[PDB]
């Protein structure tokens, strides 16, 4: 999938 586990959801594709 395209979601990336950055600390925040802004511009994470989640």
């Amino acid at each position, epitope marked *: 999938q*395209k979601c990336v586990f950055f600390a925040e959801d802004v511009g994470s594709n989640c």
Partner: antibody
Framework: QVQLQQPGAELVRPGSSVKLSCRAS????????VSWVQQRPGQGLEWIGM????????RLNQKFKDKATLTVDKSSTTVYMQLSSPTSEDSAVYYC????????????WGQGTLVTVSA | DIVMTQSPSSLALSVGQKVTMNCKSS????????????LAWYQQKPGQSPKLLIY???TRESGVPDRFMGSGSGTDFNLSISSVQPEDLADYFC?????????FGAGTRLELKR
């Protein structure tokens, strides 16, 4: 084992097309983001941006917005970065790297391509 | 863009000695909800690609010897080695994995004292 195969060295003429290749193997090409990372002579690392090979979506570093074009060839599971208007300033080692699954750090790296810009 | 500062940029060491390398960031890397810090450490040796040591500030990548230890919180982080070995003579740099664009420190080079 995950493999990211990059050429050792590319010489690119000013105002010409730097198309750098990163051949992926040992994993599902279409599932994970592939980043490009810049290392100028002993200067520390710059994240250029990344591309998802499922559809070719590209998120760039703002610094490389007008400089880097990222693409993908699913049939040769290969990632390409293209540098527009390259100068001696862009002479560096360029790595491709894989996220550790969905986590934004780099478990797998290519050996890097030493790019020399010169006429 | 989050800015990563590693000072100093070289340390001179005897083998067997404990070394602590510092990494500061311009913004806190702590996530309040899970109480986890979003910093990675890497080892690089000349003419070689970087190697993952630590993620989430203090989790060792499997295969990484337990003499390597990550610590700290917010804007201040340390990579320690409890007994520096010859093979540990390398460059080490931090990377915030908090928010894009991803950013690295300029590294700290570990050298032998004489």
């Amino acid at each position: 084992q995950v493999q990211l195969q990059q050429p050792g060295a590319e010489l690119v003429r000013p105002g010409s097309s730097v198309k750098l290749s990163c051949r992926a193997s040992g994993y599902t090409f279409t599932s994970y983001w592939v980043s490009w990372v810049q290392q100028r002579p002993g200067q520390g690392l710059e994240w250029i941006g990344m591309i998802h090979p499922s559809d070719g979506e590209a998120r760039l570093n703002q610094k490389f917005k007008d400089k880097a074009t990222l693409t993908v060839d699913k049939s040769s599971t290969t990632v390409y970065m293209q540098l527009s208007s390259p100068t001696s300033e862009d002479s560096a080692v360029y790595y491709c790297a894989l996220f550790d699954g969905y986590y934004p750090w780099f478990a797998s790296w290519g050996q890097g391509t030493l790019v020399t810009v010169s006429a | 863009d989050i800015v990563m500062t590693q000072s100093p940029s070289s340390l001179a060491l005897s083998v067997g000695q404990k070394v602590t390398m510092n990494c500061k960031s311009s913004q806190s890397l702590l996530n309040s909800d899970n109480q986890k810090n979003y910093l990675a450490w890497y080892q690089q040796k000349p003419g070689q690609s970087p190697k993952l040591l630590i993620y989430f500030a203090s989790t060792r990548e499997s295969g990484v010897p337990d003499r390597f230890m990550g610590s700290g919180s917010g804007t201040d982080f340390n990579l320690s080695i409890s007994s520096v070995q010859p093979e540990d003579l390398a460059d080490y740099f931090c990377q915030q994995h908090y928010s894009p664009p991803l950013s690295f420190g300029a590294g700290t080079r570990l050298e032998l004292k004489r």
